[PDB]
Write a protein that holds these residues in place. Sequence first.
Motif, mmCIF file in Angstrom:
data_model
loop_
_atom_site.group_PDB
_atom_site.id
_atom_site.type_symbol
_atom_site.label_atom_id
_atom_site.label_comp_id
_atom_site.label_asym_id
_atom_site.label_seq_id
_atom_site.Cartn_x
_atom_site.Cartn_y
_atom_site.Cartn_z
ATOM 1 N N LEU A 201 47.943 42.965 37.408
ATOM 2 C CA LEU A 201 48.679 41.710 37.480
ATOM 3 C C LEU A 201 49.167 41.231 36.119
ATOM 4 O O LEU A 201 49.989 40.310 36.061
ATOM 5 C CB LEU A 201 47.812 40.614 38.117
ATOM 6 N N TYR B 200 43.291 35.874 34.300
ATOM 7 C CA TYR B 200 41.876 36.180 34.442
ATOM 8 C C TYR B 200 41.682 37.379 35.358
ATOM 9 O O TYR B 200 42.376 37.535 36.367
ATOM 10 C CB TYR B 200 41.087 34.989 34.985
ATOM 11 N N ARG B 201 40.719 38.224 34.997
ATOM 12 C CA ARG B 201 40.380 39.421 35.747
ATOM 13 C C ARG B 201 38.877 39.430 35.982
ATOM 14 O O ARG B 201 38.099 39.270 35.038
ATOM 15 C CB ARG B 201 40.834 40.669 34.985
ATOM 16 N N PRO C 52 35.107 40.775 36.650
ATOM 17 C CA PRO C 52 34.437 41.917 36.017
ATOM 18 C C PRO C 52 34.203 43.045 37.009
ATOM 19 O O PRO C 52 34.189 42.853 38.229
ATOM 20 C CB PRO C 52 33.112 41.335 35.512
ATOM 21 N N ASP D 44 46.076 35.068 44.317
ATOM 22 C CA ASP D 44 46.105 36.294 43.530
ATOM 23 C C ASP D 44 44.788 36.456 42.783
ATOM 24 O O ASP D 44 44.190 35.477 42.327
ATOM 25 C CB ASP D 44 47.271 36.288 42.542
ATOM 26 N N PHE D 45 44.334 37.702 42.666
ATOM 27 C CA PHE D 45 43.101 38.003 41.951
ATOM 28 C C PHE D 45 43.090 39.485 41.608
ATOM 29 O O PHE D 45 43.849 40.276 42.175
ATOM 30 C CB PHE D 45 41.861 37.618 42.771
ATOM 31 N N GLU D 46 42.217 39.846 40.669
ATOM 32 C CA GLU D 46 42.099 41.227 40.227
ATOM 33 C C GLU D 46 40.696 41.458 39.686
ATOM 34 O O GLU D 46 40.091 40.564 39.091
ATOM 35 C CB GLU D 46 43.150 41.561 39.157
ATOM 36 N N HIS E 197 35.854 33.204 39.344
ATOM 37 C CA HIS E 197 36.514 34.504 39.345
ATOM 38 C C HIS E 197 37.890 34.555 39.996
ATOM 39 O O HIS E 197 38.524 35.615 39.962
ATOM 40 C CB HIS E 197 35.610 35.548 40.015
ATOM 41 N N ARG F 270 42.019 33.143 40.530
ATOM 42 C CA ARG F 270 43.077 32.627 39.672
ATOM 43 C C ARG F 270 43.475 31.259 40.207
ATOM 44 O O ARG F 270 42.652 30.337 40.211
ATOM 45 C CB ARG F 270 44.259 33.596 39.618
ATOM 46 N N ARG G 200 36.745 27.198 34.189
ATOM 47 C CA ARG G 200 36.210 28.300 34.895
ATOM 48 C C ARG G 200 34.714 28.253 35.014
ATOM 49 O O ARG G 200 34.118 29.199 35.370
ATOM 50 C CB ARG G 200 36.656 29.547 34.159
#
Lengths: 269, 269
Positions: A106, A110-111, A113, A130-132, B127, B129, B235
């Motif tokens: 992306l 923020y990603r 762990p 959205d997330f990764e 964690h 976004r 966060r």
Amino acid sequence: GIYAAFDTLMSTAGVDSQIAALAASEADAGTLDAALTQSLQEAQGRWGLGLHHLRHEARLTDDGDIEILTDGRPSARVSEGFGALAQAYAPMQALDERGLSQWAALGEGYRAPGDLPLAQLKVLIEHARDFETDWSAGRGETFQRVWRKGDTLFVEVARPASAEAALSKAAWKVIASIKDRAFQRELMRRSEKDGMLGALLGARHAGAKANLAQLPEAHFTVQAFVQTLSGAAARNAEEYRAALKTAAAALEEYQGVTTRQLSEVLRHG
Amino acid sequence: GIYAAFDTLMSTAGVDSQIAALAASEADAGTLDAALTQSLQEAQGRWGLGLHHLRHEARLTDDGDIEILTDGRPSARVSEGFGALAQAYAPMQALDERGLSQWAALGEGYRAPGDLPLAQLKVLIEHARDFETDWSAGRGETFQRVWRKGDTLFVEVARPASAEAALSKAAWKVIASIKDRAFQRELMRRSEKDGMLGALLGARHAGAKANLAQLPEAHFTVQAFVQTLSGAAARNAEEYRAALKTAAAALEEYQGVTTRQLSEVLRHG
């Protein structure tokens, strides 16, 4: 020529582009450019170069070439050869000591762990946008990661392998099938100093690499598989687990297929 | 005139805009437009209209007015009066049966349910976004929700109240402070038909509303408070819990302050 070269490049990722057929069927430039771009994007999902964050395109040129671009900028032309393309991609990559890309899919943001517990990842799947996640170890020497962009969830399973390692594996597959135990012993003896590839070709390691520099398999190999989900399935944890199994199985399948094909090409040397 | 009117409008949200001072100090149009817009956005966080998804701006006009816009389009001018502004906002709102906005703050996209367990919400906070939750009930008759856009986490705590309800509460505080028990008993008698405001003003419900139609408190009141966090605190689950407590306390404080001020205004009637 150029189109067949592109097709052989695509076959190293397990992609059947049929660009030569399309050109043989009097397809126009728009149709060819669209099929080229689609095939390239699919191959980028398999090569494991780690360039998910870049836009990949391929198009026909005035002088009869195929130009390959990333983010609208020219990267290489098929006429330059496969090694030139790999070298064009090289400075864009950021591989760690395990051969896994350090880039996020992306991009900036923020990603999660790699060691994220599966329950928390289920929370992300069900209720985030959205997330990764970073890479985590998976079943049997594989690594996996997941990200979601908009309406599509992406599950990537990888088992890194250099093109040289895959070539050595295919050559060893050829040597192991030799029924004449004396000849196979000689191949083993040559392999002691020169390795699998040089032994198979009866030359030094570098001489064999030089003889094989023309194959796309000398620069590209199947390293990963990306399985996608969309709609409500992109928000379902069980559909994600199933997609992960599908991705791992497809990865093993494609690596086996491309290795067997490469071995069948090697045998003639 | 216009600037003082804007300042009194801002005071219904607990915002001390000091626009009259700025204009009295011969500040230029850019400075005034920026202070107007900043004060308006802060007031929008307090009024509880539910328009987080819209861009709110205010600017000076050629003829000496103050124009209020949403998403670049004119909504109303201060010269038109406070009721005109509330009416301009009315068709943009979508309030549920509790007076809480049904619009998401992030707009079109997935929104977590109000009953999301706090353990999963901590996963989103740490964690994810961008994300958003629907309203959930909170301590002391409040409601709460949280969303994150980019680098900022927003914690909103609300205790809905119409301007008429807040006016009735202030009038009841004035009535309750009356030492003459006979007079207080008579006011309580009038309140059955005319309500608290009408009883206090010695008039019918509609007559009292008409007498107060010029005050901004007749159309706007403090209904919510939005506390923000940025950077790493955005966060962090502990910083989120603390931000939630701060938001609830500030909401109670501002509602108390505005109610006392309104009661002192009503005391003269």
